[PDB]
Design a protein around this ligand. Sequence first.
Ligand SMILES: OC[C@H]1O[C@@H](O[C@H]2[C@H](O)[C@@H](O)[C@H](O)O[C@@H]2CO)[C@@H](O)[C@@H](O)[C@@H]1O
Ligand SMILES: OC[C@H]1O[C@@H](O[C@H]2[C@H](O)[C@@H](O)[C@H](O)O[C@@H]2CO)[C@@H](O)[C@@H](O)[C@@H]1O
Ligand SMILES: OC[C@H]1O[C@@H](O[C@H]2[C@H](O)[C@@H](O)[C@H](O)O[C@@H]2CO)[C@@H](O)[C@@H](O)[C@@H]1O
Ligand SMILES: OC[C@H]1O[C@@H](O[C@H]2[C@H](O)[C@@H](O)[C@H](O)O[C@@H]2CO)[C@@H](O)[C@@H](O)[C@@H]1O
Lengths: 389, 389, 389, 389
Amino acid sequence: SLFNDKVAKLLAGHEALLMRKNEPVEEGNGVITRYRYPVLTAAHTPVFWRYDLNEETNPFLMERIGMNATLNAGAIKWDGKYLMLVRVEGADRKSFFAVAESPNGIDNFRFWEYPVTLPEDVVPATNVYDMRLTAHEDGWIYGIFCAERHDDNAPIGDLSSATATAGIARTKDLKNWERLPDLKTKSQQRNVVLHPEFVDGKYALYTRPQDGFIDTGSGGGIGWALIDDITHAEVGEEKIIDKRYYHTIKEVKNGEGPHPIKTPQGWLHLAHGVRNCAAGLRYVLYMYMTSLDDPTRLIASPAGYFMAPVGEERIGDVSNVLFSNGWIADDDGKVFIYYASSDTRMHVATSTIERLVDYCLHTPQDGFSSSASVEILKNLIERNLRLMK
Amino acid sequence: SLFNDKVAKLLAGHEALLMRKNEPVEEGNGVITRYRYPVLTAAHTPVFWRYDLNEETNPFLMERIGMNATLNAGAIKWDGKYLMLVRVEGADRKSFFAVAESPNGIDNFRFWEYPVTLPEDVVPATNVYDMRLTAHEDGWIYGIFCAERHDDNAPIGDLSSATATAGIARTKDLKNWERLPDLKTKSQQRNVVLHPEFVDGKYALYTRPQDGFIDTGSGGGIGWALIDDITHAEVGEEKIIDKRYYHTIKEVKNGEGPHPIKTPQGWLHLAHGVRNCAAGLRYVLYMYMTSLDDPTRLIASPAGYFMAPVGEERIGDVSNVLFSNGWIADDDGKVFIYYASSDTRMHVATSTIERLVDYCLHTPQDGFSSSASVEILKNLIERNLRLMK
Amino acid sequence: SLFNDKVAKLLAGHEALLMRKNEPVEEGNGVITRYRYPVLTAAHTPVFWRYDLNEETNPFLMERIGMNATLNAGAIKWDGKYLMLVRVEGADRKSFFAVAESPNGIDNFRFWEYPVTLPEDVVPATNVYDMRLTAHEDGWIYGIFCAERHDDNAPIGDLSSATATAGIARTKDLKNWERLPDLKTKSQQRNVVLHPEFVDGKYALYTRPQDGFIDTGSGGGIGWALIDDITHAEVGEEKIIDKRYYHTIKEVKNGEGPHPIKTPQGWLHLAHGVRNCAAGLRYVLYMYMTSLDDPTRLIASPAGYFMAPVGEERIGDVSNVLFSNGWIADDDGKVFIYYASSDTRMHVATSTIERLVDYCLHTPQDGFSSSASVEILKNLIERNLRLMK
Amino acid sequence: SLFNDKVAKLLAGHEALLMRKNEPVEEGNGVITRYRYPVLTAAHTPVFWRYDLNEETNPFLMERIGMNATLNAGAIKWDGKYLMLVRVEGADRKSFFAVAESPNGIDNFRFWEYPVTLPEDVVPATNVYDMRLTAHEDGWIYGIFCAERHDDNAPIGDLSSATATAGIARTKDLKNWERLPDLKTKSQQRNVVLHPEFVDGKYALYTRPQDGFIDTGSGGGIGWALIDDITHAEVGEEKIIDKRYYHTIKEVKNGEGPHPIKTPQGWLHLAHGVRNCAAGLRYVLYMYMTSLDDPTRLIASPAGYFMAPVGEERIGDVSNVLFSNGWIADDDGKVFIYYASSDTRMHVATSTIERLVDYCLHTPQDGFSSSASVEILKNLIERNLRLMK
Ligand SMILES: OC[C@H]1O[C@@H](O[C@H]2[C@H](O)[C@@H](O)[C@H](O)O[C@@H]2CO)[C@@H](O)[C@@H](O)[C@@H]1O
Ligand SMILES: OC[C@H]1O[C@@H](O[C@H]2[C@H](O)[C@@H](O)[C@H](O)O[C@@H]2CO)[C@@H](O)[C@@H](O)[C@@H]1O
Ligand SMILES: OC[C@H]1O[C@@H](O[C@H]2[C@H](O)[C@@H](O)[C@H](O)O[C@@H]2CO)[C@@H](O)[C@@H](O)[C@@H]1O
Ligand SMILES: OC[C@H]1O[C@@H](O[C@H]2[C@H](O)[C@@H](O)[C@H](O)O[C@@H]2CO)[C@@H](O)[C@@H](O)[C@@H]1O
């Protein structure tokens, strides 16, 4: 029948999309390798999430539930596989979480047939997003995410003012999720991330204090907070680890991405930095390192951005944005960086621990002015010209 | 001569552009079919609107009047033809109206040789835009549009503050237009649209009360107002029909598009919804239905967006926008939806009354939260997996 | 060795990029001719600016200093060559100046091996940008640029508030630059430009008074100020030459681009105009002319924009922007216009003095309303239809 | 496993290829419509014909039996479906027959899982090829094909000398084939085709007498032979119906394609014509019509070719060739023409009975000289110019 042929073609086209081999982009900067195709798009969501496949109830074979974007994904190596914890945004503008897995880390990502069922905390949330996964030494996988609600303080007609809390959930199988109490804290928080080891016998969070839902106000950067009990999590002392600076890529706000990778040289961090421009907010990725002895102590601050939107990345629902809350480092040192572009699609970039540490240690630090930038550059030029002779 | 050859080539290239056959995009969602090419762009404006073709006064053969965009078009079936009432924006940043016609509804749109001459109301307007055409049962074609003027209240140096009124004009041939008094109302209005039938013997308008020129403030959504005399139009009672909601595609504002289509199941509406993001305002299209017995009563509210920017649509003068104020439904049920992308160009999408009603009735309603979205999705997945077994 | 082969390929690929022949775009408006490729991108910066080429210190051969954008360039004809004074933005978000030269004006631009060393004025600047070069009759090449600093008045957490001064430097070889005192003035200034001739025996500046760092506030447009001593430059009297207007392409702000070209008909100006839209600020180019007898007197005001973003130009770090602060007119009348798109890359457009003057004189003036625009257009249509008969 | 993933991808890629929607080529001559994609290529053969899918016996997953070409196909409408009787050539250079079916006639052709098992006649054949299917009024489907054998009457070392005979088989299900005795005839024969009706109570064959295996020699064209008993088929009298002509597209040889279609105007024929050129033999398609009352009598001979190689068709194993031995005419008059290009792939072209008859009746007959061609052309030009005036 025509209907059955149509269903068969939808399914076949979907498999062809899912199975497409990714290829590295030859042109690069020697630090990271980009790939020709996104690892996930809205079109990668299962056909059976979007269409009612029953001819009796959907004779025209149209989508019943539109999928809009696959973005800001957490990531974990899981039982031999490369997993993303995807933020999937429906056409209804709500996001939910969904696991996708790949055998190789760069292609053939496929969603688990059901998305994540995440129980509410005591106060229901309207939207949940941007989960960072941490395999903690306590044996649990934690997902720390943003739980967003309408601001009850808002005046008449204001249906946009919102509040953000840090949601905390844990699991041992990524299917059954236990919802713990939202993080208790004196300001708004987003980009909260669990450090994978106890520090002084306590849970350690990366935080991002902010005075408002979008603007950080007095918030100074990426913070560090020790928590006695993750099941009744409350911030007491909070220390800023990586600061915002005028006229850098992290001027207006910043935030930790995935939890950092442990290297022999220190903790290797991936974060985002924001500035304002005539087109709105511009988000790029950057890196820094902290000490193994004292994870609050910066030991590498390469100048500028690590990655910024290139080509197709520049455009989407929220253009001029890269964002990452997930990466995977294999035992052999290979690193798979999962980053969203423009709040619309997921990409992968690859590198190695050795290359990323090299980048952090030997990209000169920002001297914070045009004159300083020129002096650093002239020094490199001089070395190169002498060599090229 | 070289000049004459140049004119001949301008004219020939223009005809080739105008005559190009459109083709449907194979990949779609089963609800609407997109098309490979826009139905109108600035390049579709006549050569003789832009160039002075006289060698004596334009020896270099350069454009004398630049055309910037063809957007936000009304639409009507007219004497066997498919007509758009185009908003054409010049390089001078003023818009004017112009009729374009096609024999088939998807390609070969051609502007009438002269654009629309629209007389001023008592108070002159600086810009006019976004006309909705209504063939009213009273025998007139009405165009309801936005008439914009500088805000006299503005302080020194403020050359941007503006006010919007609903302009009302009528015609029986789309060439001779009678300008009626601007709509009298207690707030700013844009997206005002005439319902095609009398209701309780009165003219019925879709309205969109707004506290400011761009922000709606207390304005609750798309309104309904009965008007005794369209030639002295004044709003008295006003009822909100379709409301804004936090964390939907119509959070910050919304507005009726073209006048709705009458179906056996009810009035079928096409509207736009706006939210804010890091890149600015994002505009998408959505649908709803109201009762034939009581056109103020919602009877279908499919969740989320009906159409959102895809591909080339995402980029233009005002990126991240779809907007529609025109569609045509033929007697056989075929629907031609005319929508602008990014305030720059006009597109067509096709569907049928049956498919659009199916979409409105069977796309689940928004339960307004991530948890609710997940439950709806899990229900569909469960049905499909049982079927696919 | 593999490393040496990699270096050799980086260098070879760079030469292939630099040497690529540009080609004009056939489709145009008869006023300006666009070109297929940008004249500069970040990839055009020398390999030896970005990479450490020594295997001992960079064994992975990765970039040590990322380059982000090449934009807003000044321009001058210099000893037979076509020169841009490029604003180069590093990955660190600081800009610096750098000379690039071409033998023909449309391709084969190559950076001088060292960028510009620009001494600080008494108060150090954080960023410097957008230099206009003027070969003044006094025998010096002046560069007038923006010097930006953090606003000390800013409250806690505000790392974005900034102040702009007009920096002044001069040179006779484009390598050794003398920094003069920043322009003294009662308001913020950006887009300051030196007129190439003395007027009443005084230096003459194009100015752009603004109440704030981004918003002009009461600032009325492009100004004119006579300065007694360029080495102790201070504005006294200041006159607005070209004004902002509601509902034009220069509504919110405007600014002089390069210094104007002297023609037998008057001074030929290139400027930018800004308006706000749902996507942010939109920047286009426009032209005007002033009198040789009195350079403060407007003698041509063609309506609307001269150039606006087309195609690839629309997208970049700061999308929806064209900006020019450099052009070159050869003795034969050929004009090379150097314009940035989206704060990301540099383009060239070509025309002639005769064509640009024709465009300025015969593009109708803006009558400031939709009705006026329609009347101008109908007049041209009528002439053309009579001719085409 | 990696192996199972590879098999899954082979199968998925194959289904995507098989299900691809064909699209008509817009630009045409108004007689036939070509299509963007071939209906069959060697890649369309089943994955399980080429690969051993068992990891135990094919651990590298390589092809065990290469498929080289899908060409010269018969065709029949069968139980509601569109069927080709494909000549499939293996990498071993032998051809075999195989049924492929489509629901619509222009795409989604899929081979039946097993190819045709064709029993040998008394003398074994080395190759079999180019089957024409005839649903005869006697209730059988006949396949008339070429059976080729080596000719040992050849100099030593001559392994190219061959003899072609007409093989005859019949079936009622296209799976079980009965092999009848090869046609007995005084010359070599290829392109023998069964007429679908008895003529004076006898079977009627289109023949093509030829003195050699490749060259026709004295063979004058397409012949007609009445046969008493198709199960002991022997030609007696043989009349040429359509002749070769110097300096036409059928100079060196010609041959009937599929059996002709019955129309109210006569029998509608599709044939091939051959000439020699510097590159070898050139094959094109042409048409002719014969009388219903007397099928030996020509009643239409449009000049020149009907179709000749265009674009991709020009190149393959045997370039510069079109060949057809199959077409289908639906009850509504729509005609699907299945033609091979360059002995490599199968294409479809569509027309209607009305259009093909119009083409045959109104394309002027060949007057056989340049002067005559010019006079015919000048006559049409004269009519057109007077009309265009
Ligand atoms: O959009 C850029 C980045 O903004 C942050 O989150 C958004 C969130 O995605 C929206 O749904 C909501 O309306 O506003 C938030 C605040 O701007 C950031 O956490 C990222 O999620 C996002 O990529
Ligand atoms: O730009 C998006 C949508 O905004 C609305 O209108 C604009 C109008 O087009 C502008 O010329 C003016 O400056 O501001 C208005 C308010 O934002 C909307 O009605 C649509 O016309 C437009 O697509
Ligand atoms: O971005 C558009 C235009 O804005 C102006 O300058 C920018 C400057 O480039 C930024 O680095 C700074 O942060 O803000 C300035 C004010 O918006 C303008 O002078 C152009 O440089 C620029 O193309
Ligand atoms: O085909 C190559 C070249 O052959 C010569 O002429 C051809 C002629 O074009 C054919 O029509 C005829 O059948 O055979 C001739 C002899 O090969 C040569 O003079 C060129 O015309 C032609 O390009």
